[PDB]
Every structure is written in C-alpha cells, then in structure tokens.
C-alpha cells in the first residue's frame, strides 16, 4: 500500500518543558521535533502564536494582533549567545504550569536589556520591509498604547481614526519605542524561521491556527475599522458569538466585533489574502477556526449581556474561497467544522476540497456518529482530542454508562481506564483519515488535570505543560505508526 497517511501531535509551544517558566522556540522545541522525526511523525499542530495577555485569560484566540508573534515564546538563551544579555540575567524555574504573570514581566525585561545592547539596526530595516503590511502599524500601535496607557478606541480622536499627519508626528516622537517593538517581533520571527527550517528538512509540516476574529482591542480593528461592523464612533454595532445549544443554556458571547463582509468583498478579500500569505510564512497548513462562520455567523447587538438575542447572517464563503484557492491553489486549509454544522456548511467545505475535522472523543454518544473511525473519509484530520476538550483519559473518567457501553461494544471488549488512550489512538491511526493527530496529553496518558482549555470559563486555561520525559514513549508510538502505515 502506498497512500498519503500521516500522523502528528497537537502541542502548543507554551506546553514545551523549557526552563524559563514557559515553553519557547529554543532547545526543547528542537528536542520535540527530533522526537517527531524519530517516531515517524510528519505533522505538528500548534495553537495561534499571536501575543497574549493576562486580561484575556492568556488565550491565543484573543490577541491584540492576528499577525504578530507572542514574545513570551522567545528563547532567552539566544540573547545570551548573541551577547545581548549576561549569564546572570538568565533565571531557571522548575518544570510546572505556565507562569504567564511572571514570564510577561521577566521576558520583557530580558528583551528591554537586549535592545539596549543592540546594534545591527540594518537587519531590522530589512525585516520591516518584509513585514511592512502589518508591522509598521503594530509596532506603532504598541508604542502609543504604552505612552497613553490606554486602548486604541480611548486615544485622542486623531490617532484613533488614523489621521495621516497625526500618525507621522507620534511615530517620530516614539521612534525609540517603535523600534523596540519591531526588534521584539524580529527576534520572534527569526527564531521561528530557524525552527521551521529544522522541521521542514525533517519532513515535518506545521499546522497553524487562524482565529476567525480579532479582539476589539487589536491593531487589526484599529487599522481596518471599515472591515468590521462599527458605528460612527468606531464602537461595535454588533459582536460575535454562537446561539444557545443543548450543551450550553444561553450560548457564548465572544465579544469580538463581527466582520462587515460586504466591505471585504468590495476590497477583493485582500485583507484575508494578506492573512493567509502572512501565516504561510510560518505554517504549512492553516486550521480555520470556526469555519462555519464563512457560510453564516451569529451576530448579536452590542450591549447585550448574553448571545440569546442574535441571528444568523450569511457570509460570502463561496466567493472568498474561490479567490483564496486561486491565490493558494495547493490548498493549505483545514476546517474546524465542529459544532453548529449544517449541510450548507458541509457543502461549502467539500466544494473546495477542504479537509474537515473529526474527534474520536465525540464518537460514542451516538451509534452512527460521523466521528466513528469507519465513518471518517480520507479528506479529514482525525483527532484523539483537542485543546478545547478533556484529554481522553479524563473524558473517560466522567463518561456516562451508556456511552461507555457503546465504546466497549465498538472495541468488542471492556477495557480498563488506563488502557483507553492506547485503544483510541489505534482507532484513529487505523482510520483512512489522511491526517491523524494525537493530543500530547493523550500520548502521555494524562487526565482532566492536563486539560488545556475549558470553553466558557474565562481564566485558568492555556497553562498545561509537559513535566515528564515524553521521549520514553518513543518505542511504543513508533511501533504503532508503522503498524498502521503512518510512519515515515
């Protein structure tokens, strides 16, 4: 048999066991890629690399920029190698949960110190040209936010509405601060470029993640207000979310401003094209968060406390993706098409041959679930579980008797709770899904304590890190990949 059959691991950079309070793009990232290669994995899925904040619960999906990189993921040991900091500035922390509060402050201090002892500004100018379409705006956005200590919609009216002359004045004023913020982005993107080359030379493709929406408090809304549904004062007229389920009682209010899609179509979808081009500098595949929003999105009036009184509004997905697939004909797209799926959505997805998502954790609530292995078609990415879900072992712990029965009957036997991960990994690998992805927590057989994110809950999330030597799992998982024809 000679089919396209790949396997991968879902693991966010923060979860790497790096020594400085959080995972980074340094030694441990390379060690993890070595582990991928040795096992025969071909795929690595990360979450969005956009800057995070305490205010937004450290969520990768609520950032002040859809383009920028997150400075807390920077490896500070490269700063030591380039003689930008001293050895005593480095400061080890024991392996535990991601120390967001402390790394925001600590890595900012290391980068402030490195910028002082820096020097090669000509390399910064070439970087700025390459990323001119977003970085001039982002670095200036960050410099003004620093000075005024306020969000963009609270700034003086002239800077808020991006009057040409006012932008020039404030740039020259905060010139030193402007270049600090490009320097931070320079350091991040150069470290990712190096890591990406290492991955690519070993046949590993990186699956990145594109959030549907920016946060209202972002350089993106600031720079392109007409691309969102705002009123005369640039406050949101409508905001994003999803309607009430039988899961949730009153839906979720995401609080993003919604797109004015008629304006995107008017400008030939060039903002979305720029998003894709930018992200393809980093990633091989782009997972489209809330894919169903390209067919229709839930829109609720601003000022509403819940998402109950919204409505479905059609978006121009057919026109958008026709243009995107013309610009990017090798098709980097993966659809996150879980939840609120209709046949309209499935038709949009399949019209453009975009692989869907399936998750075996969803397979045993119904006897004919489309997430059962035998129902997963080739053009799909098949997960054991995702970062929005409990790891398989913790899911199984709380699984109801009826769903347990369905699981046991599918395997043909009752199995002990500690063996469930292995059994479900096998089911995912034996499927004909072209990409099979195991969440790292499942590989390590971890429970509810290792859950990355709990949707609905604002805080406590995105903190899980590897604490153990995961390379001990290599002989077991390597064997499995080879048995099910996904070892390369």
- 3-state SS record for the chain: CCCCCEEEEECCHHHCCCCCCCCCCCHHHHHHHHHHHHHCCCEEECCCCCCCCHHHCCCCCCCCCCCCCCHHHCCCHHHHHCCCCCHHHCCCCCCCCCCHHHHHHHHHHHHHHHHHCCCCHHHHHHHHHHCHHHHHHHHHHHHHHHHHCCCHHHCCHHHHCCCHHHHHHHHHHCHHHHHHHHHHHHHHHHHHHHHHHHHHHCCCEEEEEECCCCCCCCHHHHHCHHHECECCCCCECEEEEECCCCCCCCCEEEEEECECHHHHHHCCCHHHHHHHHHHHCCCCEEEECCHHHHCEEEEEECCCCCCCCCEEEECCHHHHHHHHHHHCCCCCEEECCCCCCCHHHHHHHHHCCCCEEEEHHHCCCCCCCCCCHHHCCCCEEEECCCCCCCCHHHHHHCCCHHHHHHHHHHHCCCCCHHHHHHHHHHHHHHCCCCEEEEEHHHHCCCCHHHCCCCCCCCCCCCCCCCCCCHHHHHHHHHHHHHHCCCCC
Cα distances (Å, whole numbers) of residue 273 to 154, 279, 322:
29, 10, 12
Q: Which two tokens stand for residue 8?
A: 């991968």
Ramachandran area for residue 412 (φ above 0: left; ψ -120 to 50: alpha; else beta): left
Asked if 264 and 323 touch (Cβ cutoff 8 Å), the reply is: no
Put the strands of the sheet holding 356-359 in their side by side order.
333-335, 285-288, 205-210, 43-45, 6-10, 435-439, 380-383, 356-359
Q: Which two tokens stand for residue 468?
A: 């153990």
Q: How would you classify the pairing of strands 238-242 and 296-301?
A: antiparallel
Cα distances (Å, whole numbers) of residue 5 to 41, 437, 486:
10, 11, 5
Q: Which two tokens stand for residue 192?
A: 């990712």
Going by C-alpha positions, the residue among 134, 300, 158 that lies closest to residue 219 is: 134
Ramachandran area for residue 255 (φ above 0: left; ψ -120 to 50: alpha; else beta): left
Query: Angle at the Cα of 295 (from 290 to 299), degrees rounded to 5?
Result: 70
Q: Reduce the secondary structure of 123-162 to three states and give it as a string.
A: HHHHHHHHCHHHHHHHHHHHHHHHHHCCCHHHCCHHHHCC
Q: How would you classify the pairing of strands 43-45 and 205-210?
A: parallel
Asked if 216 and 256 touch (Cβ cutoff 8 Å), the reply is: yes
Asked if 258 and 240 touch (Cβ cutoff 8 Å), the reply is: yes
Going by C-alpha positions, the residue among 444, 440, 464 that lies closest to residue 8 is: 440
**Which residues does residue 312 pair with via DSSP β-bridges, in sequence order?**
298
Going by C-alpha positions, the residue among 322, 327, 240 that lies closest to residue 289 is: 240
Q: Which two tokens stand for residue 74?
A: 């920077």
Going by C-alpha positions, the residue among 80, 81, 107 that lies closest to residue 14 is: 107
How many whole angstroms separate alpha carbon 251 and alpha carbon 340?
11
Torsion of CA 327, 333, 336, 341, to 10 degrees: 60
Asked if 317 and 347 touch (Cβ cutoff 8 Å), the reply is: no
Burial class from Cβ neighbours inside 10 Å (0-12, 13-18, 19+) for residue 232 reads exposed
Length of the chain: 488
Cα distances (Å, whole numbers) of residue 73 to 77, 87, 200:
12, 19, 20
Question: Residue with structure tokens 């991040």?
Answer: 188
How many whole angstroms separate alpha carbon 6 and alpha carbon 362?
21
Q: Which two tokens stand for residue 103?
A: 């790394």
How many whole angstroms separate alpha carbon 138 and alpha carbon 64?
9
User: Measured between alpha carbons, how far apart are the two ends of the chain, in Å?
Assistant: 13
Measured N-to-C along each axis, helices 27-39 and 474-483 cross at an angle, to the nearest 10 degrees, of: 40
How many whole angstroms separate alpha carbon 204 and alpha carbon 53?
30
Put the strands of the sheet holding 296-301 in their side by side order.
252-257, 238-242, 296-301, 311-314
Burial class from Cβ neighbours inside 10 Å (0-12, 13-18, 19+) for residue 268 reads exposed
Residue 457: Cβ within 10 Å count? 9
Please count the structural domains in the chain: 1
Asked if 139 and 179 touch (Cβ cutoff 8 Å), the reply is: yes
Backbone angles phi, psi at 183, to 5 degrees: -60, -40
Cα distances (Å, whole numbers) of residue 458 to 56, 193, 242:
8, 32, 16
How many whole angstroms separate alpha carbon 249 and alpha carbon 191?
44
Q: Is the dihedral of CA 451, 454, 455, 460 positive or negative?
A: negative
**Which residues does residue 436 pair with via DSSP β-bridges, in sequence order?**
7, 382
How many whole angstroms separate alpha carbon 476 and alpha carbon 473?
6
How many whole angstroms separate alpha carbon 31 and alpha carbon 37?
10
Going by C-alpha positions, the residue among 304, 277, 283 that lies closest to residue 131 is: 277
Question: Residue 339 sits in a domain of what CATH number?
Answer: 3.20.20.80
Domain extent at residue 205:
1-488
How many whole angstroms separate alpha carbon 122 and alpha carbon 151?
31
**Which residues does residue 239 pair with via DSSP β-bridges, in sequence order?**
257, 300
What kind of experiment solved this structure? X-ray
How many whole angstroms separate alpha carbon 145 and alpha carbon 464?
30
Any idea which residues carry the catalytic annotation?
A: 289, 336, 388
């Amino acid at each position: 048999g000679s089919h396209m059959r790949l396997a991968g691991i879902l693991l966010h950079v923060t979860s790497l066991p790096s020594p400085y309070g959080i995972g980074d793009l340094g030694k441990e990232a390379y060690r993890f890629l070595d582990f991928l290669k040795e096992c025969g994995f071909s795929l690595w899925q990360v979450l969005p690399l956009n800057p995070t904040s305490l205010e937004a619960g450290n969520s990768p999906y609520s950032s002040n920029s859809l383009f920028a990189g997150n400075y807390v993921l920077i490896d500070p040991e490269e700063l030591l190698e380039e003689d930008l900091i001293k050895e005593r500035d480095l400061k080890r922390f024991p392996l535990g949960e991601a120390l967001y509060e402390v790394v925001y402050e600590y890595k900012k201090e290391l980068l402030e110190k490195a910028f002082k002892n820096f020097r090669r500004f000509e390399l910064l100018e070439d970087f700025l040209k390459e990323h001119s379409y977003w970085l001039r705006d982002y670095a200036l956005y960050m410099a003004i936010k620093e000075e005024e200590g306020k969000e963009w919609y609270e700034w003086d009216e002239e800077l808020k509405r991006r009057e040409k002359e006012a932008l020039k004045r404030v740039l020259n004023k905060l010139k030193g601060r402007f270049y600090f913020h490009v320097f931070v982005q320079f350091v991040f993107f150069k470290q990712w470029e190096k890591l990406r080359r290492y991955a690519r030379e070993r046949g590993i493709s990186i699956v990145g993640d594109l959030p549907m929406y920016p946060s209202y408090s972002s350089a993106d809304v600031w720079t392109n207000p007409e691309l969102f549904k705002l009123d005369g004062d640039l406050k949101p007229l409508f905001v994003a979310g999803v309607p009430p389920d039988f899961f949730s009682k009153t839906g979720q209010l995401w609080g993003n401003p919604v797109y004015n899609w008629e304006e995107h179509e008017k400008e030939g979808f060039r903002w979305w094209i720029r998003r894709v081009l930018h992200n393809l500098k980093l990633f091989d595949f782009l997972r489209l968060d809330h894919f169903r929003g390209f067919e229709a999105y839930w829109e609720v009036p601003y000022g509403e406390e819940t998402a109950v009184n919204g409505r479905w509004v059609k978006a121009p997905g057919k026109t958008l993706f026709k243009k995107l697939l013309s610009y990017f004909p090798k098709n980097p797209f993966i659809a996150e098409d879980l939840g609120f799926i209709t046949d309209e959505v499935r038709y949009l997805r399949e019209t453009f041959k975009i692989p869907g998502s399936r998750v075996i954790e969803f397979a045993f609530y119904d006897k004919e679930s489309e997430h059962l292995p035998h129902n997963v078609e080739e053009n799909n990415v098949y997960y054991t579980s995702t970062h929005d879900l409990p790891p398989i072992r913790g899911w199984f712990e709380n699984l109801g008797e009826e769903s347990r029965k369905r699981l046991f009957e599918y395997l043909g036997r009752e199995i002990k709770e500690e063996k469930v991960n292995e059994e479900l990994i096998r089911l995912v690998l034996i499927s004909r899904a072209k990409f099979a992805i195991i969440q790292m927590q499942d590989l390590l057989n971890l429970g509810n304590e290792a859950r990355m994110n709990y949707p609905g809950r604002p805080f406590g999330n995105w903190r899980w890190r590897i604490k153990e030597d995961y390379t001990q799992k290599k002989e077991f998982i390597k064997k499995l990949l080879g048995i099910y024809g996904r070892e390369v």
